[PDB]
Each structure stands twice: as structure tokens, then as C-alpha cells.
């Protein structure tokens, strides 16, 4: 059933699984019309499909042309997500296909289940975790490839860079969710922390800076500080 | 007008005949039910005074044979049997009538209730849902499970209702996933009506039979089937106009007849709120919506 704090190590076992987050699939700016009404303009979006054990990210870019002439776009966006995830699974060799797909929002359950009817042995699960994957578009290189796309496109990343050479996938996932939670709660400050020292760079083939183990401890501590402060503000405590 | 005689009544039992019911005392001189209207299926059903569990009974049509009831002390229930000797049967019935040992099927002349509940129900279709081909009549009880329930365990004792499942390859055309899931018209009209049931009359007959088994026996899988068949219609944007009008009449008489005190278990809040207020056909069931709102406004 649902994935929660009690079965958390299951994420890092040897059964292939994918998280699917649809929060950046349908993106709009809201604006006034000449007549003083309100309208939306869509911008490019993305499906965030992530293997938490390996770091492999299947970033399907959703180009605004997908929405042309369609109605009820928020509803369509769930079914388009499900269509693309199903297409991705079919594209993978059998021994690479997932045994479970965990959706970060419960509204994705029925759309994905219906699209995956051909795969009765792949479990579709919700989660009780509040995962911060909506902040994927705060990663500069991911945002850049989405905004520049002129057509539908799939781009493959490793969201852990080379971290798995030094740390386990439990620790890498914890670092990722801390970084993303920080970026989601105060993007300006989070990004300041990650680049303040101009001597630490991002490799061309990476997403995050090349921190030493000791610098990651400093970084991680600065992110936890940022999150707690923000929290006392949000709630006045 | 036909008759179902009883050999005897050795145990205290509440006896139902269609929507009517009578209490019989242990070893009371009761010898059957007369004046049963010809032209309809009927159900004769039982609840023992000492075990209010296991309601059970028999669907039958007097045009198909001469049937009677006899208690079996080994299996502990009232059984329906066919009498093949026509002159023996006539002679048994005439004696019991002369001795006035039979209750009369108590139909009010104005009253179309049973016709309205069984309009599309045929014995030949009942006998395909309830498989026991050596009898012309069909036994049902509180505990019998459906084929679909079994899939999720004795097959000979199953209710072989037509399996409906909204998240199934049968319900969902490849490439039309969102379309078919949100608008079930292709599943209703092509898969079920054209393909399986052949016409809307057979569809309504099974829906009405499922309702009656839920009401008379508390059969839970039957209640599931009844709601599923309602939901499949209400969740279709494209339904023939004659079907929607007939559906509204069918449900109206089912809701009218339901015991007021059983609405808690026999009516599914989600299906009814969805069907009357959210679905495509939310505005197509005026009579059903009015009786539901005046009789069960809590549920909604």
C-alpha cells in the first residue's frame, strides 16, 4: 500500500522502483487581458521520474504545444503524465522495468493504474511522505533544458552526480530531499548557500557543486538552519 | 392463478412471497399460498424463527411446472420441489383449498409494485445466473458469493452475474484510456449492451434481479452488482433516451419498496451521490432523485 516513514528503507533495496512527480507538468502564468479579465499562458513543464536507488532521472519535457486546443488541462495533465510513464516503461528492457511506481500525489493513482493495465505485476503506490520534488525546477540545469525545449523531449540525468561513489543511496536520497526542501522553502537563500564560495564549481556533467565530504557537512548544516528558521517565521514559534 | 402447496410447516418460520410476508408457528396447519398471479416470476423466501441468519428462498414461474414446498429435517430447510404427476398435484391443491389451509397472495388490484420490480426479469435468465439445471426453479440465500467476489469459493453455489470492472482491459480501449475511464459509453453500449447482454431489456432484468436478491436476502454481492450496473449507465455520456427514462422508473420503484430501516446497508452513498449530482445523467433521473431526496435525505 502507501509508502511512509515506517517502510522507508524499502526505497533502497534491490527491487527496481520509480517515484513519479507530476507537480511541474502543467505550468502557467496568470495574467490580465486587455479587457481586464484573467487568462493563463502555459509554459514548458516536465515529468520528474526518479529511481531513488540509482539516482537515474527520466526528465520528460512537456512542451506547451501538448495543451493546444485542449480543455480541462489540470485533468488532462494527470493522464498525459500517466501516458508518458507507461510509454517509458514499455521502452525499457524487461529487466530494467520497475516492480513498483510510487506517485507523489494520490490523484495520479487512477490515471497511472488505467494506463498500466498491461502490466498487472507492477504495483502503483501512493506515499504518505511529503516529498519536495516540485522544487526540481530550482535546479538550474534542469530548469534550463525545460525552458529551452522547442518540442517534446526526454533528457536523462543522474540527480546524485557521483555521490554514490562515496555514500549509500539512503544517504544520497536524504541529501537530495534536504537540498530540495531548502530550495522549496527559501529558494534565494538555498541557492546562496550552494554557490557562496566561488572556488567550488559545478562540473559540466553534474548538477550540484563538487563539495568535499567535509564541505557537504557544512552545506547540509546550513540547509537545516535555513529550513528551521523559515519554519519559525511561517508559524511564529 | 396458481398455487404453491406446502406439505407441512414443522418449524416456526417467517415466509415471504414477493414483497409480502407471514409468520407461521411451529406445526401450525399451514399448507401453502394460492392465487399467485400468472405472468411474472415470483420468489418464496424464508427466515427461521430460531436462526434469523441465512435468509433463503426460491425464484420460480408457475407457468413452468407445478411446484411445492416440503421441509427437510436432515438439511434443516424448506425445499422447493417439482411435482411431475399433474393429477396428484391438482388433487392435493383442491383438498387444501377446500380445507382453507392456504394463504391468498394478497395483491391489491390498483397495485403494480411487483410488475414494476420484475418488468424485465425472466426465469430463463435467472437460471443462467443461478446454475442448477436439473430444477426449473432457483435457490438463493444471504451467503452466496458472486463470480466477481470469488475472483478477488465453491463455483457451483455462485451467483454468475455479468462481471463489470471499471479498471479492466475490457472497460478501457488501448489508446482511449482517459476517454473511456471518464466516459464509460463504449463499455456500456458496445461491450455490454451490444456484446454481452444483446439488448437493454436483458441488462435491466439482471439489474432488477440483483436488487431483489439484495433486498430479500441481504446478499451483499448482489447489492454490489446492482450499484455497478447503475453506475455504468450514469457514468456514460451517451445513453439511448428510452433507457434513461426506463432506468428512472426502475430505480424509483426499487427505492419506493426498500424497507426504510435498511437504507444504511443496502444503499451506497458514493454511487448515489455521484449518480444523482455529479454524473453525466445527474439531470436524467427526475423521479428517482425526488423519491431519494424525500425518503433518504441523510444519505445525500
UniProtKB/Swiss-Prot annotation, chain A:
Region feature (RNase H homology domain): 7-237
Coiled-coil stretches noted in the UniProt entry, renumbered to this chain: none
Subcellular location as annotated: Nucleus
Note: Present with 468 molecules/cell in log phase SD medium.
Quaternary data: Component of the U4/U6-U5 tri-snRNP complex composed of the U4, U6 and U5 snRNAs and at least PRP3, PRP4, PRP6, PRP8, PRP18, PRP31, PRP38, SNU13, SNU23, SNU66, SNU114, SPP381, SMB1, SMD1, SMD2, SMD3, SMX2, SMX3, LSM2, LSM3, LSM4, LSM5, LSM6, LSM7, LSM8, BRR2 and DIB1.
Free-text note regarding domains: The MPN (JAB/Mov34) domain has structural similarity with deubiquitinating enzymes, but lacks the residues that would bind the catalytic metal ion.
Purpose of the protein: Functions as a scaffold that mediates the ordered assembly of spliceosomal proteins and snRNAs. Required for association of BRR2 with the spliceosomal U5 snRNP, and the subsequent assembly of the U4/U6-U5 tri-snRNP complex. Functions as a scaffold that positions spliceosomal U2, U5 and U6 snRNAs at splice sites on pre-mRNA substrates, so that splicing can occur. Interacts with both the 5' and the 3' splice site, as well as the branch region. Has a role in branch site-3' splice site selection. Associates with the branch site-3' splice 3'-exon region. Also has a role in cell cycle.
Protein name: Pre-mRNA-splicing factor 8
From Swiss-Prot, chain B:
Keywords: Cytoplasm, mRNA processing, mRNA splicing, Nucleus, Phosphoprotein
Region of interest (Leucine-zipper), ranges: 244-265
One Pfam family here: AAR2
Organism domain of life: Eukaryota
Keyword DNA repair: no
InterPro entries documented for this protein: AAR2, AAR2_C, AAR2_C_sf, Aar2_N, AAR2_N_sf
Protein's cellular compartments: Cytoplasm; Nucleus
One Gene Ontology term, aspect cellular component: cytoplasm
Family: Belongs to the AAR2 family.
Note: Present with 7330 molecules/cell in log phase SD medium.
Subunit structure, as described in the record: Heterodimer. Interacts with PRP8 (via RNase H homology domain and MPN domain), competing with BRR2 for the same binding site. Component of a U5 snRNP complex that contains at least the U5 snRNA, PRP8, SNU114, AAR2, SMB1, SMD1, SMD2, SMD3, SME1, SMX2 and SMX3, but is not a component of the U4/U6-U5 tri-snRNP complex.
Name of the molecule in the record: A1 cistron-splicing factor AAR2
Naturally occurring in which organism (per UniProt): Saccharomyces cerevisiae (strain ATCC 204508 / S288c) (Baker's yeast)
